Paper text:
Transient receptor potential vanilloid (TRPV) channels are a group of six polymodal cation channels subdivided into two subgroups by their sequence identity and functional properties. TRPV1–TRPV4 comprise the first subgroup of non-selective Ca2+ channels, TRPV5 and TRPV6 constitute the second subgroup of Ca2+ selective channels. TRPV channels are blocked by ruthenium red (RR), a universal pore blocker for a wide array of cation channels. Here we use cryo-electron microscopy to reveal the molecular details of RR block in TRPV2 and TRPV5, members of the two TRPV subfamilies.
Next, we prepared cryo-EM grids of wild-type rat TRPV2 reconstituted into nanodiscs in the presence of 1 mM of the robust TRPV2 activator 2-APB and 1 mM RR. Therefore, we used a high concentration of RR to ensure saturation. This dataset yielded a single stable high-quality state: 2-APB-activated RR-blocked TRPV2 (TRPV22APB+RR) with C4 symmetry at 2.9 Å resolution. The strong extra density at the TRPV22APB+RR SF was clearly visible from early stages of data processing before application of any symmetry and is aligned along the central symmetry axis; the size and shape of this density is consistent with the expected dimensions for RR and density consistent with 2-APB is present at our previously proposed 2-APB binding site and not in the vanilloid pocket. The SF of TRPV22APB+RR has adapted to accommodate RR, with tight coordination by the backbone carbonyl of Gly606 along the interior of the SF and the lower gate is closed at Met645. The primary site for RR stabilization in TRPV22APB+RR is the carbonyl of Gly606, which at distances of 3.0–3.2 Å can form hydrogen bonds with ammonia groups coordinated to the central and bottom ruthenium atoms. Additionally, density for the top ruthenium atom was more poorly resolved than the lower two ruthenium atoms, indicating that the top ruthenium group is not tightly coordinated. The only significant conformational difference between TRPV22APB+RR and TRPV22APB_AC is at the pore, where a downward rotation (9°) and shift (1.1 Å) of the pore helix to accommodate RR leads to subtle shifts in S5 and S6 which constrict the lower gate at Met645. The rest of the channel maintained the previously observed activated conformation, where the C-terminus is in a helical conformation rather than the loop conformation seen in the inactivated state. Our TRPV22APB+RR structure revealed that binding of RR to the 2-ABP-activated TRPV2 stabilized the channel in an intermediate conformation, preventing ion flow through the occluded SF and closing the lower gate at Met645, but at the same time inhibiting the transition to the inactivated state. This TRPV2 locked in an activated conformation allowed us to resolve clear density for 2-APB in our previously proposed 2-APB binding site, but not in the vanilloid pocket, a recently suggested alternate 2-APB site in mouse TRPV2.
Residue numbers in the entry:
A (entry chain A), B (entry chain B): 31 to 45, 72 to 417, 429 to 530, 532 to 563, 589 to 694, 699 to 720
The structure:
């Protein structure tokens, strides 16, 4: 285990009048500069420096200056200025101010990080004025984002200040003469203070207000400080911009704010929403499509559909501009959606005919042509599904609850092709596969219920249970096998249940409401056999009643309004897929919106126009 | 797509020192009148006028004055007075102030509409003083009432002011010397400012308070301004008065207010409720029956029962006066309701006897007389239902959930007459129709459960499910046919399910709790047949459990108090129908209430007396 960062109780580990580490750590933690007065002479005589291993905590590299800054009284410690002076007077080739922790838990942590976290502006000035490097990165495992004891803030001093909500510190780090911070500076993950603010977001009303106020403030500060730099166009090492990371992470509160952002006055160029005209309850705005429109690779639309794993995903697609943008893409695409459904219906009708009236193991030529059409249709679907899974490869397995139709379309195509292979091999097992393929092909027809709102919102309200059906079956099949062996073993002796599979299927019938209690008067232990069947029935009815109740509690503890939101996400995934066109013929992707000058920095952007009517909001504005 | 009404970003389309449109639109949008100083000379030299196509936006006809009024700074634009002066000085045969948009989206929109919407009283005065026509109608598709981007306010300047809650503007438009507005003036739909206020209503607490305050204020203003005009007696082009339109539209908050309206002092003639005497918790009021009592065609009672499609309909019939009026009409009618039920019981008893003991394909004469009575009874019911559907023709298909008994009474009569026709033709299919008619005739008996409160409120709480029964059957019958073809196809091969209909009916039994899992040891693929039946059962139980849960969520998310309200609406529909009498004998409709002088304008009205006891309200009035 790593040592505590500071402790009143446990001493730091080991792993002319004398001035050892424990003497030094005692004076600086008490804060009494007059007791430091032998130290320069001792160091000089020995040729030792305060950076040396003998003066650190052995396991971390934590120095006397870090010890001093961990121990502040009313934001001050009178040792810091003398101790820094002694380092300068010593002639150390390294600088004490820039010393860092070397432990795998606290790696790169420095006195400046501690000063900022202790909220002492005086110490921040005092360190920066004495040559503190404002770009050292606290990159150790305590500082990385994961489960358990950690605090991610980015890794830089400016990013800590921002995430700790210290505006005085942030402005001093940016504006100071000695070593000004950079808004462009980046951590070991490529995250810039704007990315760090997106990562610390939690979608809570308070955290959101802090994050939004610190994000906007820094963006305004950047407009003054570094006017030639687009701070929101800088990408992580995963090639995400702060808006794209807010989408990936599912930080809906900050995502909404960035996407909708509007300012008047000198900061207008920092807007993404530009209000165009109002009339009564009608508001028309232009929205900036930059990095949002599916025209370009790795957009927020593709990230929300494919790369995000947040439960928030459906809530994100119903925000403007995305809600109107996706509606326009759907209105353009919907003819191709019903054409695809028509082709699938024709294929499934030909499949149904070819399955239904087929000989036992002109009309023969029509049956052969029918087999050929379903073989070709099965190959075509197989290729299309293989291309889908290959195109998704970097983010497969994100959401089975959105993906499962793509697996079942693959499965139906595989069994169709395999059945037609076995039919060419003339082997009787082809008929089972063709019939099982017909069954999946009819069930797969439910995919298209998303293409109509009436059937799309009903299907989404329902399609709740298929996750619970497994948990039931797995638990129950364990009861089933135990009672099945017990029945077979007990039925061997004469004065039914002949095999484990036979007995399991009888016990299954008793579960699904098809049971048959009677005295089995053929066999010796008929009373004990009846006891087992009674016990099995009662335990099964308990387990079913438990399942029903568990499920019903999650029905009372539910909100109906998600149904429309989840249906919009299904249409979004459909739109984004079919905007590519088919595996055998790529689509020309045209850009949405139009290119307009929104001001001067010439600030020209692809803007999408959105018209919103809001009687409630407008009436609140009246006298 | 139509252009934006105004844009900072997109220039208006095209489709002596020079003074083109872009020079002109630039000066007036900036608001700098000194830059306008060449324009008169240029226009004069060319013989051009500011109304001409060259100076408009080409696609809309939007003029420089509309551009000027779209761009107000602190409610002003210093260009307007110079620009109007230049139009007068030009000698234009048209007047710039009265220029209007010609686009199909903004048709008839004018500078005065924009000024009012921008809430600039100064511009309204400045336009009216320079000859603005206060009766131009904004009738384009943006201004009509429909789905998507629009704002209906009526179409007139006075109606916009009222719906935008501008009392200063409303009074100035009414009272000014130059061109006074008319409270009687009417839009392209016949709607007068009072109708427009009913159309903008939404039944929300805030919208209702605005609408009510603007309606009452205008009605008081009309009493002063145009004393000889009954503003509430003016009809739409659909022949509806503002009260009747509030009923049709289902605007229950404004409907209640108009219906119940009471004033003391100089405005007393504007009342519809007149308080008569109070004693402790007892209040007696007269209510004005004008346009409310079913005596006259197209009353609010007939509109609520027949012509309204709002979910609010049941809430509207329980307001006074209507609640006591309908109770008095029911108390008068109820003998005829039970007489009709007695005749239907006698017919259904004779039908039951004649169906039950009938020969295979004196007592014979009694059976023939029984057939004649049910033929005549079936003809009589057929005619009565045909007359009902013809009388309803303008508003059939409003509410199947209120109408369905009128369809099922028609259906039973058709099958009865047709069965007796086939019985005269001596063909064996008559017995199925007579028996199917008997079944419907017994189910139709449930209609009369509304005639008693004990059975009327119980039936209404229940009769929830019949809409969900279809959605279940349709989805489920698609699973059924897919598995049915699959079973038939798989059962053809020997070592049950012989036909698609046979297999479908077996799979139906498995759904309704009558299933039969067994190894079908007669046929080759018995294991795969059992796999299909297991899969079918499990998918069916998932689909049933989904339906049960969906339905149960709409049971927790429900309010029981609607039951009594919906039963009153059923009695209202019954009352209004039977007040006509029968298809073979029209009823004399007597008027309700009595003719009383409620004041002097002699203000004599048909008043209905209502007595209400309200301990709770009265006790709040005590010290
Ligand atoms: C109207 C007459 C049709 C005759 C039958 C043709 C074979 C159809 C095979 C089939 O079922 O295709 C369905 C497919 C839509 O797939 P999807 O995107 O919904 O699947 C995934 C949904 N979850 O449809 C398409 O991709 C478009 C149809 C084929 C275009 C021509 C192909 C030419 C190839 C050289
Ligand atoms: C007491 C002895 C009765 C002997 C049987 C007479 C035939 C009755 C046929 C029948 O079922 O009539 C029901 C009908 C009421 O209909 P409704 O308004 O409830 O239907 C719609 C409800 N949803 O009832 C009536 O309209 C009134 C009864 C008939 C009056 C005499 C007719 C003379 C014609 C020249
Ligand atoms: N034939 C299309 C009917 O649409 B509906 C529908 C039918 C089956 C599955 C899903 C939706 C519908 C939904 C609610 C009430 C009434 C009908
Ligand atoms: N015979 C008339 C009984 O009325 B009740 C009634 C019976 C059947 C259908 C509807 C209502 C009733 C209602 C609630 C509690 C008890 C009885």
């Amino acid at each position: 285990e790593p040592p505590p960062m500071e402790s009143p109780f446990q001493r730091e580990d080991r792993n002319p009048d004398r001035f050892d580490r424990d003497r030094l750590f005692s004076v600086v933690s008490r804060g009494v500069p007059e007791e430091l007065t032998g130290l320069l002479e001792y160091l000089r005589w020995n040729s030792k420096y305060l950076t040396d291993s003998a003066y650190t905590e052995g396991s971390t590299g934590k120095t006397c200056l870090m010890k001093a800054v961990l121990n502040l009284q009313d934001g001050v410690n009178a040792c810091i200025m003398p101790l820094l002076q002694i380092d300068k007077d010593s002639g150390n080739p390294k600088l004490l101010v820039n010393a860092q922790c070397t432990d795998e838990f606290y790696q790169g942590h420095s006195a400046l990080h501690i000063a900022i976290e202790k909220r002492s502006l005086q110490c921040v000035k005092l360190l920066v004025e004495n040559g503190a490097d404002v770009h050292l990165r606290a990159c150790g495992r305590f500082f990385q984002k994961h489960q358990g004891t950690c605090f991610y803030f980015g890794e830089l001093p400016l990013s800590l200040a921002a995430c700790t909500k210290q505006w005085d510190v942030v402005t001093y780090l940016l504006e100071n003469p000695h070593q000004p911070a950079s808004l462009e500076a980046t951590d070991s993950l490529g995250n810039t203070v704007l990315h760090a603010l997106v990562m610390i977001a939690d979608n809570s009303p308070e955290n959101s207000a802090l994050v939004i106020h610190m994000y906007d403030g820094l963006l305004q500060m950047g407009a003054r400080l570094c006017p030639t730099v687009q701070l929101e166009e800088i990408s992580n090492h995963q090639g995400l911009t702060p808006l794209k990371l807010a989408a990936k992470e599912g930080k809906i509160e900050i995502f909404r704010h960035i996407l909708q952002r509007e300012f008047s006055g000198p900061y207008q160029p920092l807007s993404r929403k530009f209000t165009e005209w109002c009339y009564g309850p009608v508001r028309v705005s232009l929205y900036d499509l930059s990095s949002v429109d599916s025209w370009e690779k790795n957009s927020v639309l593709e990230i929300i559909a494919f790369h995000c794993k947040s439960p928030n995903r459906h809530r994100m697609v119903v925000l403007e501009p995305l809600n109107k943008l996706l509606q326009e893409k759907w209105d353009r695409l919907v003819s191709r959606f019903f054409f695809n459904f028509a082709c699938y219906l024709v294929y499934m009708f030909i499949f149904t005919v070819v399955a239904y009236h087929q000989p036992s193991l002109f009309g023969e030529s029509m049956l052969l042509l029918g087999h050929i059409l379903i073989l070709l249709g099965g190959i075509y679907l197989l290729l299309g599904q293989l291309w889908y899974f290959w195109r998704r490869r970097l983010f497969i397995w994100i959401s089975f609850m959105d993906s499962y139709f793509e697996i079942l379309f693959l499965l139906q195509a595989l069994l169709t092709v395999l059945s037609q292979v076995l039919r060419f091999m003339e082997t009787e097992w082809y008929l089972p596969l063709l019939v099982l393929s017909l069954v999946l092909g009819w069930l797969n027809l439910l995919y298209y219920t998303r293409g109509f709102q009436h059937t799309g919102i009903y299907s989404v309200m329902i399609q709740v249970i298929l996750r619970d059906l497994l948990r039931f079956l797995l638990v129950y099949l364990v009861f089933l096998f135990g009672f099945a062996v017990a029945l077979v073993s007990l039925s061997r002796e004469a004065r039914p249940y002949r095999s484990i599979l036979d007995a399991s299927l009888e016990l299954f019938k008793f579960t699904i409401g098809m049971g048959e209690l009677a005295f089995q008067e053929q066999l010796r232990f008929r009373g004990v056999v009846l006891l087992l069947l009674l016990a099995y029935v009662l335990l099964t009815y308990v387990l079913l009643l438990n399942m029903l109740i568990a499920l019903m509690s999650e029905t009372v503890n539910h909100v109906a309004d998600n149904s429309w939101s989840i249906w919009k996400l299904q249409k979004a995934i459909s739109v984004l897929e079919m905007e590519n066109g088919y595996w055998w013929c790529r689509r020309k992707k045209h850009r949405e919106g139009r290119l307009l000058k929104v001001g001067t920095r010439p600030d020209e952007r692809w803007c999408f126009r959105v018209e919103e009517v809001n009687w409630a909001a407008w009436e609140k504005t009246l006298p």
